């Protein structure tokens, strides 16, 4: 798989167990971003997985 990572542009508070909460600056590994506008992510600071809203992130590296 890809080793690219994304960075959060804003804080986000999850509204459901399926979705991550994250902080601005958090580095997120995307497992998939080809099925819809919410992407399947892995936090490289908490280790949790969950969906994130793709408008809240940008590529970092």
């Amino acid at each position: 798989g890809s080793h690219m990572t994304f960075v959060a542009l804003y804080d986000y508070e999850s509204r459901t167990e399926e979705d991550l909460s994250f902080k601005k600056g958090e580095r997120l590994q995307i497992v998939n971003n080809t099925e819809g506008d919410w992407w399947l992510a892995h936090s490289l600071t908490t280790g949790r997985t969950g969906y994130i809203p793709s408008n809240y992130v940008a590529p970092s590296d």
């Binding site: 542009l9 804003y10 804080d11 986000y12 399926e18 998939n32 099925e35 819809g36 506008d37 919410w38 992407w39 399947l40 969906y51 809203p53 793709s54 408008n55 809240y56």
Partner: peptide, 12 residues
């Protein structure tokens, strides 16, 4: 059913 296919939330 897909969890990816939801509308995006507003930026804050």
């Amino acid at each position: 059913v897909s969890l990816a296919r939801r509308p995006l939330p507003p930026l804050p």
